[PDB]
Coordinates of C-alpha atoms and ligand atoms in Angstrom, one line a residue:
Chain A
X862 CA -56.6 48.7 22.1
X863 CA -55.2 51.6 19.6
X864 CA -52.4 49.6 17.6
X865 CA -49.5 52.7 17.8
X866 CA -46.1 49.8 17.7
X867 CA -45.6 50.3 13.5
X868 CA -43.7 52.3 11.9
X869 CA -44.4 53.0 8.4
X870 CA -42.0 53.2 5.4
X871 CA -41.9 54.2 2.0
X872 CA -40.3 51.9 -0.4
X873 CA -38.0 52.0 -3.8
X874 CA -36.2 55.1 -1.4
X875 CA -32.9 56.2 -3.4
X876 CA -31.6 59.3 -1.0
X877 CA -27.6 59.3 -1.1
X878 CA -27.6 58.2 3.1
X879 CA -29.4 56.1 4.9
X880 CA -33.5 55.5 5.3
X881 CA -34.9 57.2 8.5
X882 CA -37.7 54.6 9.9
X883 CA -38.3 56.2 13.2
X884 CA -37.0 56.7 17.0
X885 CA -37.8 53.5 19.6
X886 CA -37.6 55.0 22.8
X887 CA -39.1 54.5 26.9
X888 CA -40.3 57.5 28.9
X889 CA -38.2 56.2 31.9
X890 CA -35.1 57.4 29.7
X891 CA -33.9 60.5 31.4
X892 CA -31.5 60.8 28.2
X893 CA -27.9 60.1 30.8
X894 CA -26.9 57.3 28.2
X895 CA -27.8 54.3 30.9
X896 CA -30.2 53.0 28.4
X897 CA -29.2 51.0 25.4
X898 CA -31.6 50.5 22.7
X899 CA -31.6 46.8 21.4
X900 CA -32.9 45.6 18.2
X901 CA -33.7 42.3 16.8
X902 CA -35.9 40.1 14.8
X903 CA -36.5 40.2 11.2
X904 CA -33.5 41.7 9.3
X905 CA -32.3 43.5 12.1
X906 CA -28.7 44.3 12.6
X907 CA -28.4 44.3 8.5
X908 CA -31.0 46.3 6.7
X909 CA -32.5 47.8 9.9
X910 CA -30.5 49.1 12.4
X911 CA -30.7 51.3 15.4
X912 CA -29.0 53.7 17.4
X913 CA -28.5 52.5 21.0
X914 CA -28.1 55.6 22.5
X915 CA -31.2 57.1 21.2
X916 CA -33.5 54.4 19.3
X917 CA -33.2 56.0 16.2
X918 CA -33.9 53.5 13.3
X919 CA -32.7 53.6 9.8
X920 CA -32.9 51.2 6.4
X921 CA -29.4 50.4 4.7
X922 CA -30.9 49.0 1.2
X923 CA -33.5 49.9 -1.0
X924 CA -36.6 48.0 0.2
X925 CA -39.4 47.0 -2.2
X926 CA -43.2 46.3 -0.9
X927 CA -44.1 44.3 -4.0
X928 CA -41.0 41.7 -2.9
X929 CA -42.2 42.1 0.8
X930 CA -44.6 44.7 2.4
X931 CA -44.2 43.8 6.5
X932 CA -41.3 43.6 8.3
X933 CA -41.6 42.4 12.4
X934 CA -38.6 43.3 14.9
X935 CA -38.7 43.3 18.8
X936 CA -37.8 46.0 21.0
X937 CA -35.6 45.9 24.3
X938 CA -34.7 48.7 26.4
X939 CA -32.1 47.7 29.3
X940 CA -30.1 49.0 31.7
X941 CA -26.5 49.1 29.8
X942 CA -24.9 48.6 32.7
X943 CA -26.2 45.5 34.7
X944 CA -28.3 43.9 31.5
X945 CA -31.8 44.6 33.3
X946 CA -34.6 45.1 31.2
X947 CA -36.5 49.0 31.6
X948 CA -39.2 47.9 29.7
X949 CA -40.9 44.5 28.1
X950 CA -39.4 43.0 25.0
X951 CA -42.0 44.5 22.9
X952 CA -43.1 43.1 19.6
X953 CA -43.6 46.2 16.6
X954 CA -43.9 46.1 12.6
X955 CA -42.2 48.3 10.0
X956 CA -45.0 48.8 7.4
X957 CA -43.9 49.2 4.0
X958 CA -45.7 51.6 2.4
X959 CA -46.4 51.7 -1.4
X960 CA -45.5 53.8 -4.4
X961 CA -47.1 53.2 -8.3
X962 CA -44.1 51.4 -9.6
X963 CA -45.7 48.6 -11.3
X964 CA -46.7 48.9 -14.5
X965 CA -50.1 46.8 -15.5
X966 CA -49.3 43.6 -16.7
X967 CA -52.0 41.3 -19.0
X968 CA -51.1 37.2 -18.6
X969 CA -50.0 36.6 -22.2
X970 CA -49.0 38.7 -25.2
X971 CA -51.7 37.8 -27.8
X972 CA -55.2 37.0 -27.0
X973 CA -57.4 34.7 -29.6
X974 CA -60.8 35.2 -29.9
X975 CA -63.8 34.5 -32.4
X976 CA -67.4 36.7 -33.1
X977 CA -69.9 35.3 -35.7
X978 CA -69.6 37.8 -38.9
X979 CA -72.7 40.1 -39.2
X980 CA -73.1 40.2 -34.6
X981 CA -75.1 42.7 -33.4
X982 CA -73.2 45.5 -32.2
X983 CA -72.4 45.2 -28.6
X984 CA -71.6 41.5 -29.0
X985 CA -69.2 40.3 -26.9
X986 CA -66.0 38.6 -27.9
X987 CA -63.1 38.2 -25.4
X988 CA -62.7 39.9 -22.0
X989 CA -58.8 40.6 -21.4
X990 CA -58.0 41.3 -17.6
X991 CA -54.3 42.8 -16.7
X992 CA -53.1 42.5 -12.8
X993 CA -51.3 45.2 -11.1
X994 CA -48.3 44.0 -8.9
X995 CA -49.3 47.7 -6.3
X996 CA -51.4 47.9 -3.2
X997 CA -54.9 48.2 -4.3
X998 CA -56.2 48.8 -1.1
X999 CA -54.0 52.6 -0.9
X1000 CA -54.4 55.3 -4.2
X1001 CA -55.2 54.4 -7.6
X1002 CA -51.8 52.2 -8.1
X1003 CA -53.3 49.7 -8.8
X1004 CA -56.8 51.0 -10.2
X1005 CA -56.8 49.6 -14.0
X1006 CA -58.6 51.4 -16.8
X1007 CA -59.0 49.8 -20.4
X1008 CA -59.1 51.5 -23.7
X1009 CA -58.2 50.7 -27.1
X1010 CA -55.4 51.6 -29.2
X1011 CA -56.2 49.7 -32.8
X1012 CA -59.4 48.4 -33.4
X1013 CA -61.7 50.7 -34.0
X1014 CA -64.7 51.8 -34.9
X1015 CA -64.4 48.3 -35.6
X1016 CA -64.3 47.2 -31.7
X1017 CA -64.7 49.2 -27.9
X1018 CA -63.5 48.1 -25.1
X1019 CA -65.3 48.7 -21.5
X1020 CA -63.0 50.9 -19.4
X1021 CA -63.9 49.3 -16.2
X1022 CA -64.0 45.5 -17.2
X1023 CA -61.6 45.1 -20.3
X1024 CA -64.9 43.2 -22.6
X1025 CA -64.3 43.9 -25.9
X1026 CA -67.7 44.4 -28.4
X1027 CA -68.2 44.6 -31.8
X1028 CA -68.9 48.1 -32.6
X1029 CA -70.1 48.3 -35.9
X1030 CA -72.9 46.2 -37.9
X1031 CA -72.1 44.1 -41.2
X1032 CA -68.6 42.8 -41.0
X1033 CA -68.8 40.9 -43.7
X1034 CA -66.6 37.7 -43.4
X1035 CA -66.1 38.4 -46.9
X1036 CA -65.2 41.3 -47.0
X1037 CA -62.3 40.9 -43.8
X1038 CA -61.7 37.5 -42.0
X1039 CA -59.1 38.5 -39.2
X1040 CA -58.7 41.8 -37.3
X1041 CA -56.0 42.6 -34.8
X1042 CA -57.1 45.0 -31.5
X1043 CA -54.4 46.5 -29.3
X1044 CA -55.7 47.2 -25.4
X1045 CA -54.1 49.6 -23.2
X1046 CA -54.3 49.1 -19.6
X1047 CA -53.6 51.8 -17.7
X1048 CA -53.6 52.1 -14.0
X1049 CA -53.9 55.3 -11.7
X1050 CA -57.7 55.3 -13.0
X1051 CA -56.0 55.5 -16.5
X1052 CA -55.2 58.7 -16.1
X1053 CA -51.9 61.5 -16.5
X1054 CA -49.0 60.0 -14.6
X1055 CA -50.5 56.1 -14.7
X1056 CA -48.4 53.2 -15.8
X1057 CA -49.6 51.6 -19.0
X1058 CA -49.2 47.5 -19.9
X1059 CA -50.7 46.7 -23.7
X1060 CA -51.6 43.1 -25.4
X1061 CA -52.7 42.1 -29.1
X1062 CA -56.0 40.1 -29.6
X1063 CA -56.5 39.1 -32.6
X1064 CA -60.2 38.4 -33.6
X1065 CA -61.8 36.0 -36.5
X1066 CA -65.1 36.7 -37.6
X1067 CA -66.7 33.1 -38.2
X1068 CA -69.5 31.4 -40.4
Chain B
X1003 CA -43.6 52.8 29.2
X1004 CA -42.5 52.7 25.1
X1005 CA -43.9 55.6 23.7
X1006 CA -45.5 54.4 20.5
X1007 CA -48.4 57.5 19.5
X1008 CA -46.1 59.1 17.6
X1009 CA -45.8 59.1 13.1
X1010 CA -42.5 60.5 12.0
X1011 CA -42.9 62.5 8.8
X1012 CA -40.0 63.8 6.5
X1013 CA -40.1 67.5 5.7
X1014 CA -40.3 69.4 2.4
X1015 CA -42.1 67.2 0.9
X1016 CA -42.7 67.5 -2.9
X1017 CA -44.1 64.5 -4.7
X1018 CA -47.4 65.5 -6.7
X1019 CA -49.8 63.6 -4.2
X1020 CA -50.2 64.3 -0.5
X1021 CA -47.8 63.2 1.3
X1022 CA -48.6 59.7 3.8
X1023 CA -48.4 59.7 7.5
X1024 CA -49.8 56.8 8.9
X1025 CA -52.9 55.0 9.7
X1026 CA -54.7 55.1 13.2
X1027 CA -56.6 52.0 13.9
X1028 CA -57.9 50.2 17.4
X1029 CA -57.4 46.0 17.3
X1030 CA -61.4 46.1 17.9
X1031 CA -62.1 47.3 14.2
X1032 CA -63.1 44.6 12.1
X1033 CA -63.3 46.1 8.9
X1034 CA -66.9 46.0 8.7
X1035 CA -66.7 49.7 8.3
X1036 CA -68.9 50.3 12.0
X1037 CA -66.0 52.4 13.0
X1038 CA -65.2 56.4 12.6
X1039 CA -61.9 56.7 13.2
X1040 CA -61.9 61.4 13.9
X1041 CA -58.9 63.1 13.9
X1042 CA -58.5 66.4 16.2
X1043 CA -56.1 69.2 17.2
X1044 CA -53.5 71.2 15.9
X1045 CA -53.9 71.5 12.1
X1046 CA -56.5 68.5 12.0
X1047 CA -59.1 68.7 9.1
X1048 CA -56.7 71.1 7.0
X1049 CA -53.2 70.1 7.3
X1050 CA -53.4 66.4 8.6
X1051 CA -56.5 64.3 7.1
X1052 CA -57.8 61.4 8.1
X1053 CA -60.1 58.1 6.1
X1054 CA -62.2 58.2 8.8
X1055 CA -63.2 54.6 7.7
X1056 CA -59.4 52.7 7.6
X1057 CA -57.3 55.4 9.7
X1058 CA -54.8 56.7 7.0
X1059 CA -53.4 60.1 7.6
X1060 CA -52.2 62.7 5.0
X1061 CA -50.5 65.5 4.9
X1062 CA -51.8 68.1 2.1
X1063 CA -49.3 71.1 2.2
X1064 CA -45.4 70.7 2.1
X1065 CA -43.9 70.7 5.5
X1066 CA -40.8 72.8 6.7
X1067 CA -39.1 71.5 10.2
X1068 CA -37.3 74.8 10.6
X1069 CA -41.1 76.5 10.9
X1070 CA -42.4 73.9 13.2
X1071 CA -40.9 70.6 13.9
X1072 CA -43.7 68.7 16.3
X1073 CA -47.1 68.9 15.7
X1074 CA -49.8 67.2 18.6
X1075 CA -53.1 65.6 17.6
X1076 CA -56.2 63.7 19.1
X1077 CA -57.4 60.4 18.3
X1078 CA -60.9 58.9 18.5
X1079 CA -62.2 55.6 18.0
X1080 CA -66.1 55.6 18.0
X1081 CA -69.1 53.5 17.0
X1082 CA -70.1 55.0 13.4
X1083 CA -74.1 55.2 14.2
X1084 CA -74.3 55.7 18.3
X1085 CA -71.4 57.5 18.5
X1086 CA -70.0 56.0 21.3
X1087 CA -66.6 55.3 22.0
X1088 CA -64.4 52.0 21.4
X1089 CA -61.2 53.6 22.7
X1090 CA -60.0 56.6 24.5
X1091 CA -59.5 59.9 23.1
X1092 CA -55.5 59.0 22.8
X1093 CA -53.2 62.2 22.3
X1094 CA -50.4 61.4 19.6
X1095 CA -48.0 63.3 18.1
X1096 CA -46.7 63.8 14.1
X1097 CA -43.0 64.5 14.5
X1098 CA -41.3 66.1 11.5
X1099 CA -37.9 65.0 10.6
X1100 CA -35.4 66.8 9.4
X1101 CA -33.7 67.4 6.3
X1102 CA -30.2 69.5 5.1
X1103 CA -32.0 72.2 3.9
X1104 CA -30.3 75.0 5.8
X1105 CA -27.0 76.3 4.8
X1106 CA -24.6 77.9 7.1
X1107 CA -25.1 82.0 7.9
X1108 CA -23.2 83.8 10.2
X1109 CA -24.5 87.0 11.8
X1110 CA -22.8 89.7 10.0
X1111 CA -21.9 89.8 6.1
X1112 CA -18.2 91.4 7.4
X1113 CA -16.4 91.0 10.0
X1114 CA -13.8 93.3 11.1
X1115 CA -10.7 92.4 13.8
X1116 CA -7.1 93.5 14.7
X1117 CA -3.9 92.0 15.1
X1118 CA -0.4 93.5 15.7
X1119 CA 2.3 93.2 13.5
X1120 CA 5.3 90.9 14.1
X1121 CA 2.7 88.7 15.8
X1122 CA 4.3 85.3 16.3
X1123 CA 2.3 82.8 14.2
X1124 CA -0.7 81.1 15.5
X1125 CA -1.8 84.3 17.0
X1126 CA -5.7 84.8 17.4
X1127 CA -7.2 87.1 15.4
X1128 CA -10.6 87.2 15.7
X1129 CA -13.7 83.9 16.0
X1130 CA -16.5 83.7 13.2
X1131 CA -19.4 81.2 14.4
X1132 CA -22.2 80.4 11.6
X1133 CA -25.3 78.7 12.6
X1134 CA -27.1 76.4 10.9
X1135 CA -31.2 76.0 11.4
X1136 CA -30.7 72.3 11.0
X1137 CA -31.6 69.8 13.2
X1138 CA -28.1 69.1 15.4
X1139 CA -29.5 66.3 17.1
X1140 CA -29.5 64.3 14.1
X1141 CA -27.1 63.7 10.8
X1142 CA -24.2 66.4 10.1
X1143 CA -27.0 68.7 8.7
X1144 CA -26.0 71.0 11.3
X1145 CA -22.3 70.1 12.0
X1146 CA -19.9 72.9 10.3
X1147 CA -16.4 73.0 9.4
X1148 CA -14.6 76.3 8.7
X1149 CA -12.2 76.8 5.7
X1150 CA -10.4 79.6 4.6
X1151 CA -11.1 80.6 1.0
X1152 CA -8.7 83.8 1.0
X1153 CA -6.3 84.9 3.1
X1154 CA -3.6 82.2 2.9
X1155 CA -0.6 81.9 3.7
X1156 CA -0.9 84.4 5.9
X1157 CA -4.2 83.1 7.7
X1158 CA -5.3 80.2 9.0
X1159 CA -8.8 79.1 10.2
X1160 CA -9.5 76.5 12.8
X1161 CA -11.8 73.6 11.0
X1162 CA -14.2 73.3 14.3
X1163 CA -13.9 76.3 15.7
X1164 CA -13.4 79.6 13.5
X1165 CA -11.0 80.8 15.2
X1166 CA -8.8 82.8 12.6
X1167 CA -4.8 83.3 13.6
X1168 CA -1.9 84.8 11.9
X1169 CA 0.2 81.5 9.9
X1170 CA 3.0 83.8 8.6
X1171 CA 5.9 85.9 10.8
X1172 CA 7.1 89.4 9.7
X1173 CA 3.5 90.7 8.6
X1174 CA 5.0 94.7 8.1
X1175 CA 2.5 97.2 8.7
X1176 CA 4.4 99.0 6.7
X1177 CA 4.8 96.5 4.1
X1178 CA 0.6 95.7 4.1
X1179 CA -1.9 96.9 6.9
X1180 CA -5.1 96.0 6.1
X1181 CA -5.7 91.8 4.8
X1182 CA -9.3 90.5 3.4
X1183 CA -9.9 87.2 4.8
X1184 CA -12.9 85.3 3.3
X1185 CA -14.2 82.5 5.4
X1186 CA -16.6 79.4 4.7
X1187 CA -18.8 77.4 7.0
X1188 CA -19.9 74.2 5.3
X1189 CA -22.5 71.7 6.9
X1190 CA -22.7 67.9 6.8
X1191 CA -19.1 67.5 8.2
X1192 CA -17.6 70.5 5.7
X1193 CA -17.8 67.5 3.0
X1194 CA -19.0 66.6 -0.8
X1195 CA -22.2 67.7 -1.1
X1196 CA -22.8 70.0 2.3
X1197 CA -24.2 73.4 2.0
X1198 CA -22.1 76.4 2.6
X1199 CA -22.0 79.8 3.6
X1200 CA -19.2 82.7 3.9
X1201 CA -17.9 85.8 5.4
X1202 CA -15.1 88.5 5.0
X1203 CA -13.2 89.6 7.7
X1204 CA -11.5 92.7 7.5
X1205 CA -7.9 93.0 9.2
X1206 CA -5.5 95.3 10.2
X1207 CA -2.0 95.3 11.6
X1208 CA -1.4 97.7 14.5
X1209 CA 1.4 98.8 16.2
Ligands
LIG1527 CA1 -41.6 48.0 -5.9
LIG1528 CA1 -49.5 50.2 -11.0
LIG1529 CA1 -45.5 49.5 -5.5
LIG1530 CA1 -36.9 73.4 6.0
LIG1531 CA1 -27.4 72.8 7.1
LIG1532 CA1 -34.0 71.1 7.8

């Protein structure tokens, strides 16, 4: 059973007039006007609202996927003049579909972490993981990629996973006690155009 | 019967990725990935392009209604490895929706008409009609309103119609015998933010 009652709508829209969403209609309409178009159901008759004449659809407000991504409505098609239903009251969706507008996000400001003084390099010391509000199942909105802004040649960070190694061999204790490493993570693959969230760890080399 | 197997996609697009239509998908699928979900028809495989494993539909050149405002494609289901069907081959189409992107032109850049002199006021001169490529059918993209930019006092210009009459008495054709009337059509109701186009008429008084 192909699944064709959805319509699918781009969110965060900011056109002066109204949000086109799409045309409900029944091929028993000869277009005479004896038809009426009802909606209802989830938010209709407020932000979605239809044309009864022809069953065009349209959005009032600005919607936003990441406050709600699925909208379901039913669909009536009657007789305007005696109240018979034409067709079944049909159930459809109104998909919202997503844009990059959420910038990657890490759970707290400053990380702490520790690494023995003199580790080989490679040796691990915290892994730092930022979530992207997008749809990671559509584009590279939500696709995070990890670099670092302060910390090196000192530390690297793995683009894919966000582990941060010691790069370099003998950092002496003496010598420096406490760095501080800035991560970037930014989505769209980290690449031009991607949103970009950044955190402070700050590391101790121990005894 | 609704008529669902359609996607409604908004011309001109111009964001820097390709531009989403909609996902095709059968109730059957799973999500195991066992389906190939083929798109075929007009402008499949260039145009329009499919994930053959989820259904989502693209668009990779920038659309314009005014060239060609329906476009009618194929769907297919199948099994990924016997290629056998799981649903019909269902015909749907992509409808492009329309945008103001068409300002109002009339025919010819001047028009030329007569009118005697001593004409009692309101008499008709001559009709200017601009058309607009918009789509009528829907929004004031298409609606246009007449104003008269020069030619006043002793023109007037019918808002709906174009119709262009005398508005003063005791025009001497010896006094003045030929008048430059310029003319505007603007769409979306002849309102803030409607495209416009003009026209001069050319008049004479006769005797
Ligand atoms: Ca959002
Ligand atoms: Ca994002
Ligand atoms: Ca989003
Ligand atoms: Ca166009
Ligand atoms: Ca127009
Ligand atoms: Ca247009």
């Amino acid at each position: 059973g192909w699944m064709w009652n959805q319509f699918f709508l781009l969110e965060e829209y900011t056109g002066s007039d109204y949000q086109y969403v799409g045309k409900l209609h029944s091929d028993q309409d000869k277009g005479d006007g004896s038809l009426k178009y009802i909606l209802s159901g989830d938010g209709a008759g407020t932000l979605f609202i239809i044309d009864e004449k022809t069953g065009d659809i349209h959005a009032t407000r600005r919607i936003d996927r990441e406050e709600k991504a699925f909208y379901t409505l039913r669909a009536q098609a009657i007789n305007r003049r005696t109240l018979r239903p034409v067709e079944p009251e049909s159930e459809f969706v109104i998909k919202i579909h997503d844009i990059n507008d959420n910038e990657p996000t890490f759970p707290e400001e400053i990380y702490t972490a520790s690494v023995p003084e003199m580790s080989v390099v490679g040796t691990s010391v915290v892994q730092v993981t930022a979530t992207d509000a997008d749809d990671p199942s559509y584009g590279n909105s939500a696709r995070v990629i990890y670099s670092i802004l302060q910390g090196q040649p000192y530390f690297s960070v793995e683009p894919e996973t966000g582990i941060i190694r010691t790069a370099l061999p003998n950092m002496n204790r003496e010598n420096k006690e406490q760095y501080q490493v800035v991560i970037q993570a930014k989505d769209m693959g980290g690449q031009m155009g991607g949103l970009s969230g950044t955190t402070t760890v700050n590391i101790t080399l121990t005894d």
